[PDB]
């Protein structure tokens, strides 16, 4: 049975998608002085009887999701209710926004150190890895959908597609989906293919934001249209693609890493299991 949203306060919206938002929200009566925050998400305004049924797909989805470095459905509204869902209000906001406030410590104003960034990264690795092996692939990973907690907790999420600040990551064309073709293995975007493989790929994206400290956009200074042709030159595989460069706080070790991660070969990129293990242990003698 599910939660009685009359006992919801809304507060602040903190992501808008194609049939939903979320909003923090208060919870009236996990000491006695402080209200309980959740964040909640509901249907968009504009909703129809298709943002109903995609929202009871989302639910299913959800109920699934059981991993300390992944979003955990806490509720559902009341059935007389209006549809919510009820997840942690994750208080340090999108890892994006939340790494870009940093800097890198300069070993000779918040800032943020190597090692940090690191366990930051293998806690990603290790959501991923579960993910892996309920053969569920994200198809969105990228640091604007990794949310962070208290002491650099992280979890991953997918949401907020439609954010004003996340715009320029989404390729929109008239009558298709709307692609983070940046974030995209070349054969997800010639053929549509999304794997577990394709989820590594856009893992060695994010692992890249993350050691950026999220200051840059992958392939920033390329156009939509040439990072489209790019995944091309992968597919002619005539050595005339392109990869992300090596960010200045990441090891030349760390960098081969996220370049096995864009392998043309699906099956030569490494499984999350590998780049956990790497990330917790092997990245520290470096
Ligand atoms: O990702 C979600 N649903 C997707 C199906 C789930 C999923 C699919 C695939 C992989 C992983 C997860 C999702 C749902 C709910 Cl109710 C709420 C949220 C957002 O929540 C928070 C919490 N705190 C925050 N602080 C600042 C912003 C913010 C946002 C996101």
């Given at each position: 049975?599910?939660?009685?949203?009359?006992?919801?306060?809304?507060?602040?919206?903190?992501?808008?998608?194609?049939?939903?938002?979320?909003?923090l929200c208060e919870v009236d009566s996990?000491?006695?002085?402080?209200?309980?925050?959740?964040?909640?998400?509901?249907?968009?305004?504009?909703?129809?009887?298709?943002?109903?049924?995609?929202?009871?797909?989302?639910?299913?989805?959800?109920?699934?999701?059981?991993?300390?470095?992944?979003?955990?459905?806490?509720?559902?509204?009341?059935?007389?209710?209006?549809?919510?869902?009820?997840?942690?209000?994750?208080?340090?906001?999108?890892?994006?926004?939340?790494?870009?406030?940093?800097?890198?410590?300069?070993?000779?104003?918040?800032?943020?150190?190597?090692?940090?960034?690191?366990?930051?990264?293998?806690?990603?690795?290790?959501?991923?890895?579960?993910?892996?092996?309920?053969?569920?692939?994200?198809?969105?990973?990228?640091?604007?959908?990794?949310?962070?907690?208290?002491?650099?907790?992280?979890?991953?999420?997918?949401?907020?597609?439609?954010?004003?600040?996340?715009?320029?990551?989404?390729?929109?064309?008239?009558?298709?989906?709307?692609?983070?073709?940046?974030?995209?293995?070349?054969?997800?975007?010639?053929?549509?293919?999304?794997?577990?493989?394709?989820?590594?790929?856009?893992?060695?994206?994010?692992?890249?934001?993350?050691?950026?400290?999220?200051?840059?956009q992958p392939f920033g200074q390329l156009?939509?249209?040439?990072?489209?042709?790019?995944?091309?030159?992968?597919?002619?595989?005539?050595?005339?693609?392109?990869?992300?460069?090596?960010?200045?706080?990441?090891?030349?070790?760390?960098?081969?890493?996220?370049?096995?991660?864009?392998?043309?070969?699906?099956?030569?990129?490494?499984?999350?299991?590998?780049?956990?293990?790497?990330?917790?242990?092997?990245?520290?003698?470096?």
């Open positions: 049975v599910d939660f009685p949203r009359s006992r919801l306060r809304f507060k602040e919206k903190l992501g808008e998608g194609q049939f939903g938002e979320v909003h996990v000491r006695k002085g402080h209200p309980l925050l959740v964040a909640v998400k509901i249907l968009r305004p504009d909703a129809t009887k298709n943002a109903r049924n995609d929202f009871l797909k989302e639910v299913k989805i959800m109920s699934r999701l059981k991993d300390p470095n992944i979003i955990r459905l806490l509720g559902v509204c009341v059935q007389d209710d209006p549809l919510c869902m009820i997840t942690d209000y994750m208080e340090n906001g999108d890892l994006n926004q939340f790494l870009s406030a940093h800097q890198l410590e300069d070993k000779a104003d918040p800032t943020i150190s190597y090692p940090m960034l690191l366990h930051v990264a293998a806690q990603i690795a290790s959501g991923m890895r579960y993910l892996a092996t309920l053969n569920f692939v994200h198809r969105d990973l990228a640091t604007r959908n990794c949310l962070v907690g208290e002491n650099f907790t992280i979890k991953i999420a997918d949401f907020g597609m439609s954010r004003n600040l996340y715009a320029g990551d989404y390729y929109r064309v008239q009558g298709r989906a709307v692609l983070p073709i940046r974030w995209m293995a070349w054969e997800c975007i010639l053929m549509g293919k999304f794997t577990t493989a394709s989820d590594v790929w856009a893992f060695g994206v994010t692992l890249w934001e993350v050691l950026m400290l999220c200051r840059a156009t939509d249209e040439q990072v489209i042709e790019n995944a091309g030159e992968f597919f002619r595989d005539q050595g005339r693609q392109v990869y992300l460069s090596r960010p200045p706080a990441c090891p030349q070790g760390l960098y081969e890493l996220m370049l096995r991660c864009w392998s043309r070969e699906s099956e030569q990129r490494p499984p999350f299991s590998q780049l956990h293990r790497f990330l917790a242990e092997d990245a520290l003698n470096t």
